[PDB]
């Protein structure tokens, strides 16, 4: 279904705040923003899609994403907050794309 202005703004907000939360987690963990992002995304999408990312220095497999997920869940409450923010951020990204999929058709039909 198409997004109401409120819904659109909400999802966009969750996305932006999500990216910010990934940056924050990069600050705290001392880890790579890319690696963390890929892990969060992997957990949101599930084990269905797991693959090596060209930019990552480490091959991404269930083992590695599990270790990183556990190193994320081993944070204090106020730090662990940003993990939830990030998760819901990725989910919101997914829904935003899936909702705006029609615009692409309406534009592409002219090309």
């Amino acid at each position: 279904p198409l997004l109401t202005l409120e819904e659109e703004v909400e999802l966009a907000r969750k996305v932006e705040e999500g990216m910010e939360a990934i940056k924050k987690l990069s600050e705290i963990t001392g880890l790579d923003p890319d690696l963390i992002r890929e892990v969060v995304r992997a957990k949101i999408l599930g084990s269905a899609r797991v693959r090596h990312i060209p930019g990552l220095k480490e091959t991404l497999d269930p083992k590695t994403v599990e270790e990183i997920d556990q190193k994320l869940k081993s944070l204090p409450k106020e730090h662990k907050r940003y993990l939830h923010i990030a998760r819901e951020g990725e989910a919101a990204r997914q829904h935003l794309i899936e909702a705006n999929l029609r615009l692409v058709v309406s534009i592409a039909k002219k090309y």
Partner: protein, 52 residues
């Protein structure tokens, strides 16, 4: 409004009540589409705390 405590002092044929009263005064806030509510239902807030 409810009366928590009631003190009574008699003068002449009349009584004077010093009442300790507690009540709640409502205030409405209009939320525009670009605003988001950061507070749950029935939550308790203080002075300075962000609502929307």
């Amino acid at each position: 409004v409810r009366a928590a405590q009631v003190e009574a002092e008699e003068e002449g044929e009349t009584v004077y009540l010093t009442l300790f009263l507690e009540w709640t005064e409502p205030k409405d806030y209009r939320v525009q589409p670009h605003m988001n509510v950061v507070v749950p239902e029935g939550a308790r807030v203080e002075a300075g705390d962000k609502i929307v």
